[PDB]
Design a protein around this ligand. Structure first.
Ligand SMILES: C[S@@+](CC[C@H](N)C(=O)[O-])C[C@H]1O[C@@H](n2cnc3c(N)ncnc32)[C@H](O)[C@@H]1O
Length: 175
């Protein structure tokens, strides 16, 4: 999966923004089939990968089949972190998306709801100084989403590697 379109998108983002750093522990949301995971596995010390769908095992990657919107997500991540001896992760990254309709407003709406839940997970588990990378389909809610969530971070960036964008938040502050 090292050669997938999704993998190339992540390589581009790491080159430009260093959003994940060598030795980081990462919660990866929307991991299947594993392009980002394989790119991250070259750099991260530990990845906890989450998806609705099965994907092939990768040595040392902790995979959790889970719907992030449902009731077990926090217990599942808590257990995985406990077993890894990690209190707070360095990054939360998400390429999660549901089925695409081809309609910018609809795809934005679905993507926004995913983004909200990704951020709820991020603020729960990120270390001070940690980063977020998340895919979003741009729309009405995007500027307000950024304005709200960037209050918990030192800075943010938006990138486009045709309404799909990647939002990055840098340097988490629990304060
Ligand atoms: C664009 S694919 C991700 C590709 C991946 N980054 C790669 O490089 O192989 C999006 C993934 O998001 C997952 N996803 C969508 N909604 C989800 C949810 N509520 N909980 C967990 N995963 C979800 C889907 O099952 C799907 O596998």
């Amino acid at each position: 999966q090292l050669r997938s379109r999704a993998a190339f998108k992540l390589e581009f983002l790491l080159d430009r923004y260093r959003v994940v750093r060598k030795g980081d522990a990462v919660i990866e949301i929307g991991s299947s089939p594993g392009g980002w995971t394989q790119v991250l596995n070259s750099l991260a010390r530990k990845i906890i990968s989450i998806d609705l769908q099965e994907m092939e095992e990768i040595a040392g990657v902790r995979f959790i089949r889970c719907d992030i919107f449902k009731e077990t997500i926090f217990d599942d991540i808590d257990r995985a972190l406990r077993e890894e001896g990690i209190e707070k992760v360095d990054d939360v990254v998400s390429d999660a998306m549901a089925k695409v309709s081809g309609i910018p407003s609809r795809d934005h709406a679905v993507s926004y709801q995913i983004g909200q839940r990704v951020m709820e997970i991020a603020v729960r588990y990120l270390r001070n100084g940690g980063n977020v990378l998340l895919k979003q389909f741009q729309g009405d809610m995007t500027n307000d989403f950024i304005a709200i969530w960037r209050k918990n971070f030192s800075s943010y960036k938006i990138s486009k590697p045709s309404s799909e964008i990647y939002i990055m938040f840098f340097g988490f502050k629990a304060e």
